[PDB]
């Protein structure tokens with residue numbers, strides 16, 4: 001316990017950056033806003049069974065992420081960092097259990113390398129600070145893998161093996177309550193593939209199959225029964241609905257995602273392979289985890305980046321052992337390569353200053369470019385001081401390097417606030433809230449705004465195409481305007497209300513109905529049907 005004062009320092013500096021950075025960006029739609037708002041509505045209603053999005057049934061996802069977010073709301077009230085609490089705790093959880101399994105099978109030093117690996121991995125840290133279900137599922141599934149590895153260690157008693165096995169099945173249950181059957185399909189897949197490569201059938205006896213299935217059913221079934229009974233249309237939807245938004249992604253879709261999301265360790269990607277090929281083989285289990293899940297999502301029709309996040313913890317374990325075998329000169333090689341590519345990021349950072357996308361003007365991206373450049377600069381600093389610390393050992397150099405990378409990608413994420421804040425609509429929320437009341441409708445005229453209703457603490461009344469709310473709009477049609485043509489009669493003859501639409505929608509409806517503009521930004525026009533709810537015009 002000589003240099004423990006460094007570790008305590010390191011982790012401390014990590015944790016404060018881990019949580020403070022949560023509350024420094026406005027919510028980025030659709031995901032962050034969608035789950036923050038669903039959780040808000042659950043929090044305000046108390047109905048933890050029937051998930052609703054803008055007062056409409058939302059049966060596209062299971063509720064565990066929302067349960068966690070709602071507990072967070074009850075403890076610390078509504079806000080940005082509270083809405084991102086589930087994913088941050090999921091990230092810490094993946095780090096923790098990952099280096100627990102690493103410490104069990106490969107020792108303390110390798111476990112430290114695993115924690116550093118997951119910390120520096122931009123996919124794990126970014127995804128850990130971005131409110132989406134993929135990081136929650138990644139943390140609970142990392143509990144599946146880690147608990148499975150803990151339970152298969154020979155030096156554990158039958159009581160410990162059963163404890164880690166029921167812990168594994170329980171984690172699979174939570175995962176099913178997080179994003180559906182994936183939480184059990186991917187493990188089983190990774191399981192059978194394993195038993196085909198190693199030809200160890202007796203492993204199916206160590207799983208505690210009966211007890212684990214029973215405890216998993218006890219965890220998952222109650223909510224599914226409740227929501228299926230209260231809403232008979234739920235099971236056919238959740239298990240049959242082919243969801244799609246506005247697919248067609250190549251089989252190489254997740255290749256730049258996995259490479260970029262594990263970038264500070266890309267140079268040792270071969271040394272990860274030579275980590276698994278070289279009774280129970282844990283590194284091989286992690287490798288079959290990452291590879292099997294990767295090829296599973298790579299051959300799937302629907303592809304989203306977050307799908308691939310659950311492979312990162314396993315990679316972390318592999319990284320932990322690979323870095324554990326490196327001499328000082330080899331890590332020097334890695335530092336040289338990463339210094340090169342980070343310097344290329346610094347030279348290429350002005351590229352984003354020439355961007356304008358998602359109806360966000362170029363200026364915000366000019367302000368993003370300086371933050372990206374700063375990010376690669378702090379990466380370079382961390383690399384330099386790591387090279388200075390290489391004389392004291394590989395582990396301190398890797399620790400400083402990983403800290404530099406983590407702070408770097410953290411700066412790169414916080415810099416996204418430049419383009420995320422004008423899109424969130426939080427700026428024009430106070431202007432709207434001055435005249436908008438909770439009993440007033442806020443029509444969404446063919447626009448599913450994912451962030452503004454959260455900031456208004458006020459749900460949208462969907463008008464016309466409800467997008468992913470279509471299903472909800474059809475099973476409870478008394479809560480929704482079916483088409484814009486009915487919205488015109490509601491608008492000219494109904495109660496005083498407001499409406500959110502796109503600018504092109506405003507110009508399309510302008511010759512039809514006169515509307516007084518309450519607020520505008522680059523992505524939305526907010527109007528009222530009475531002149532007294534807006535500024536002079």
Ligand SMILES: C[N+](C)(C)CCOP(=O)(O)O
Pocket residue numbers: 059060061179180181182237238239240241242243
């Ligand atoms: C996306 N969805 C929830 C509508 C269908 C997916 O369900 P499942 O793959 O968990 O069975």
Ligand SMILES: [Cl-]
Pocket residue numbers: 040044078457
């Ligand atoms: Cl509220």
Ligand SMILES: [Cl-]
Pocket residue numbers: 421422427
């Ligand atoms: Cl701004």
Ligand SMILES: [Zn+2]
Pocket residue numbers: 060241242243244468
């Ligand atoms: Zn859908």
